[PDB]
Ligand binder design. Structure first.
Ligand SMILES: [Zn+2]
Ligand SMILES: [Zn+2]
Ligand SMILES: [Zn+2]
Ligand SMILES: [Zn+2]
Ligand SMILES: [Zn+2]
Ligand SMILES: [Zn+2]
Ligand SMILES: [Zn+2]
Ligand SMILES: [Zn+2]
Lengths: 73, 75
Protein backbone atom coordinates (compact mmCIF):
# COMPACT_ATOMS: atom_id res chain seq x y z
CA UNK A 1 0.00 0.00 0.00
CA UNK A 2 1.32 3.56 0.24
CA UNK A 3 0.53 6.86 1.99
CA UNK A 4 2.43 10.16 1.98
CA UNK A 5 3.69 12.18 4.95
CA UNK A 6 4.31 15.79 4.52
CA UNK A 7 6.45 17.84 6.75
CA UNK A 8 6.75 21.55 7.52
CA UNK A 9 9.24 22.49 4.79
CA UNK A 10 7.14 20.60 2.24
CA UNK A 11 9.46 17.56 2.16
CA UNK A 12 7.21 14.70 1.00
CA UNK A 13 8.14 11.22 2.33
CA UNK A 14 6.49 7.91 1.36
CA UNK A 15 5.61 5.06 3.72
CA UNK A 16 4.92 1.33 3.24
CA UNK A 17 1.88 1.24 5.54
CA UNK A 18 -0.35 -1.22 7.32
CA UNK A 19 -4.08 -1.03 6.59
CA UNK A 20 -5.27 -1.37 10.19
CA UNK A 21 -1.85 -0.27 11.26
CA UNK A 22 -2.18 1.79 14.52
CA UNK A 23 -0.83 5.35 14.76
CA UNK A 24 1.85 4.27 17.24
CA UNK A 25 2.79 2.05 14.32
CA UNK A 26 3.13 4.88 11.82
CA UNK A 27 5.31 6.91 14.19
CA UNK A 28 7.71 3.96 14.42
CA UNK A 29 7.89 3.82 10.62
CA UNK A 30 8.83 7.46 10.38
CA UNK A 31 11.51 6.74 12.92
CA UNK A 32 12.72 3.64 11.10
CA UNK A 33 12.86 5.92 8.02
CA UNK A 34 14.08 9.34 9.24
CA UNK A 35 14.95 8.92 12.92
CA UNK A 36 12.60 11.12 14.91
CA UNK A 37 11.29 9.50 18.06
CA UNK A 38 7.56 8.79 18.02
CA UNK A 39 7.21 10.70 21.30
CA UNK A 40 8.17 13.82 19.37
CA UNK A 41 5.85 13.61 16.38
CA UNK A 42 2.16 14.44 16.13
CA UNK A 43 0.20 13.49 13.05
CA UNK A 44 -2.74 15.25 11.53
CA UNK A 45 -5.07 14.07 8.84
CA UNK A 46 -7.69 16.18 7.17
CA UNK A 47 -7.66 18.65 10.06
CA UNK A 48 -7.89 16.10 12.88
CA UNK A 49 -4.93 15.16 15.07
CA UNK A 50 -4.65 11.41 15.04
CA UNK A 51 -4.07 9.57 18.33
CA UNK A 52 -1.93 6.41 18.65
CA UNK A 53 -3.87 3.18 19.11
CA UNK A 54 -6.44 4.27 16.55
CA UNK A 55 -5.91 2.67 13.14
CA UNK A 56 -5.52 4.22 9.69
CA UNK A 57 -8.90 2.72 8.81
CA UNK A 58 -10.48 4.06 12.00
CA UNK A 59 -9.89 7.42 10.27
CA UNK A 60 -10.69 6.14 6.78
CA UNK A 61 -7.26 6.55 5.21
CA UNK A 62 -6.69 4.87 1.87
CA UNK A 63 -3.78 4.22 -0.41
CA UNK A 64 -2.76 7.29 -2.33
CA UNK A 65 -4.04 9.17 0.72
CA UNK A 66 -2.08 12.02 2.24
CA UNK A 67 -1.14 12.48 5.84
CA UNK A 68 0.47 15.78 6.05
CA UNK A 69 0.81 14.42 8.74
CA UNK A 70 2.63 16.34 9.81
CA UNK A 71 5.48 17.02 12.15
CA UNK A 72 5.65 17.24 15.90
CA UNK A 73 7.96 18.12 18.74
CA UNK B 1 -8.89 34.34 33.70
CA UNK B 2 -9.51 31.07 31.81
CA UNK B 3 -10.30 30.67 28.12
CA UNK B 4 -11.13 27.58 26.12
CA UNK B 5 -9.58 26.28 22.94
CA UNK B 6 -10.92 23.62 20.62
CA UNK B 7 -8.01 21.39 19.65
CA UNK B 8 -7.39 19.60 16.38
CA UNK B 9 -7.69 16.47 18.48
CA UNK B 10 -10.98 17.98 19.51
CA UNK B 11 -10.58 17.45 23.20
CA UNK B 12 -11.09 20.89 24.66
CA UNK B 13 -7.97 22.32 26.23
CA UNK B 14 -7.81 25.09 28.80
CA UNK B 15 -5.64 28.24 29.00
CA UNK B 16 -4.65 30.77 31.65
CA UNK B 17 -4.63 34.18 29.98
CA UNK B 18 -4.99 37.85 30.68
CA UNK B 19 -7.37 40.37 29.13
CA UNK B 20 -4.59 42.23 27.30
CA UNK B 21 -2.66 39.18 26.11
CA UNK B 22 -1.65 39.50 22.45
CA UNK B 23 -2.43 36.65 20.04
CA UNK B 24 1.16 35.72 19.43
CA UNK B 25 1.09 35.41 23.23
CA UNK B 26 -1.67 32.81 23.08
CA UNK B 27 0.07 30.76 20.46
CA UNK B 28 3.17 30.59 22.65
CA UNK B 29 0.97 29.23 25.42
CA UNK B 30 -0.46 26.59 23.12
CA UNK B 31 3.09 25.75 22.02
CA UNK B 32 3.91 25.16 25.69
CA UNK B 33 0.94 22.82 26.19
CA UNK B 34 0.96 20.94 22.87
CA UNK B 35 4.34 21.52 21.29
CA UNK B 36 2.90 23.21 18.20
CA UNK B 37 4.93 26.09 16.85
CA UNK B 38 2.99 29.30 16.70
CA UNK B 39 3.88 29.78 13.08
CA UNK B 40 1.65 26.81 12.31
CA UNK B 41 -1.47 27.63 14.27
CA UNK B 42 -4.26 29.98 13.26
CA UNK B 43 -6.90 30.93 15.73
CA UNK B 44 -10.49 31.86 15.12
CA UNK B 45 -13.04 33.30 17.37
CA UNK B 46 -16.67 33.78 16.71
CA UNK B 47 -16.05 33.43 12.98
CA UNK B 48 -13.16 35.90 12.73
CA UNK B 49 -9.57 34.81 12.35
CA UNK B 50 -7.54 36.55 15.01
CA UNK B 51 -4.21 38.17 14.08
CA UNK B 52 -1.17 38.26 16.39
CA UNK B 53 -0.46 41.63 17.99
CA UNK B 54 -4.09 42.32 18.65
CA UNK B 55 -5.19 41.48 22.19
CA UNK B 56 -7.88 39.21 23.60
CA UNK B 57 -9.74 42.35 24.71
CA UNK B 58 -9.47 44.04 21.35
CA UNK B 59 -11.53 41.10 20.14
CA UNK B 60 -14.01 41.31 22.99
CA UNK B 61 -13.07 38.02 24.65
CA UNK B 62 -13.98 37.21 28.27
CA UNK B 63 -14.17 34.47 30.83
CA UNK B 64 -14.86 30.90 29.75
CA UNK B 65 -14.99 31.90 26.12
CA UNK B 66 -13.67 29.49 23.54
CA UNK B 67 -11.48 29.72 20.49
CA UNK B 68 -11.42 26.82 18.03
CA UNK B 69 -8.02 26.11 16.40
CA UNK B 70 -6.38 24.88 13.18
CA UNK B 71 -3.04 24.59 11.32
CA UNK B 72 -1.71 27.01 8.73
CA UNK B 73 -0.20 24.38 6.45
CA UNK B 74 1.87 27.08 4.73
CA UNK B 75 3.68 24.85 2.23
ZN1 LIG C 1 12.08 9.15 23.85
ZN1 LIG D 1 2.22 9.50 20.98
ZN1 LIG E 1 -4.67 18.80 3.82
ZN1 LIG F 1 -11.18 0.86 16.46
ZN1 LIG G 1 0.18 39.52 33.75
ZN1 LIG H 1 6.65 28.45 28.72
ZN1 LIG I 1 2.76 34.21 13.68
ZN1 LIG J 1 -3.54 46.57 20.16
Amino acid sequence: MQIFVXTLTGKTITLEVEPSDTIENVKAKIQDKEGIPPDQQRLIFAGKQLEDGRTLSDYNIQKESTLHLVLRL
